[PDB]
Amino acid sequence: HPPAVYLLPPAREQLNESATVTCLVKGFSPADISVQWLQRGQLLPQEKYVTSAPMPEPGAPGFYFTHSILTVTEEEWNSGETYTCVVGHEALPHLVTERTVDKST
Amino acid sequence: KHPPAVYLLPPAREQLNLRESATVTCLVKGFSPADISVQWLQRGQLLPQEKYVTSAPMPEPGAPGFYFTHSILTVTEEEWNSGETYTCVVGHEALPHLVTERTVDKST
């Protein structure tokens, strides 16, 4: 069962500071999964994001769930650049699925 | 018609370790019809929309005719650790009392 990926932008709240971009990954098994992030199609280094170890998905026995949370500056977020959450998983025929967001999202 | 089930997830320990932000997640599942409000209350007050992020409802993969959504609230790790409470507020017409709430804090 491949992961479903939902990528949420930071809150609209006008930042003066860090912006948080949130990648929710659910409905997958086995628990083995990879998550990386892009800015403008380029790999961001690990230090900018944190990915939770997969845990059993609440409300879905047999499946797991992880969050990956990217921190960027308000300026980096408000530049209008595209951010991509890239998820690798063995159930995907093309091995990977991704989502993208940007300040307009 | 079927009322939502609500699961309020505290921030992952891996995030809190960084001593920066804390992301609280409200997962809302198994409801019908699709129409729903999912929202946050902090310090006894409903937060303005620009302070959180809520997705439009989506079809539940396994359950044709049922929907789900999620909402997230991101605060500082210090605030979270200080014992602040966070309440997910969910409005749906299948709920007898119309609105249901869940609260989380550091203790759980």
Curated annotation (Swiss-Prot), chain A:
Q: List the disulfide bonds.
A: C23-C85
Q: What sections of the protein cross the membrane?
A: none
Which parts of this chain are annotated as the region Important for oligomerization? 1-105
Chain positions covered by the region annotation CH4: 1-105
Put simply, this protein is called: Mu' chain
What is the name of the gene encoding this protein?
A: Ighm
Report which part of the complete sequence is shown: 328 to 434 of 454
UniProtKB/Swiss-Prot annotation, chain B:
Region (Important for oligomerization) spans which residues? 1-108
Give the region (CH4) as residue ranges.
1-108
Effect on the protein of changing L41K: In TEPC183 and MOPC 104E; requires 2 nucleotide substitutions
Q: List the disulfide bonds.
A: C26-C88
Which named protein is this?
Answer: Mu' chain
Which residues of the entire protein appear here: the answer is: 327 to 434 of 454
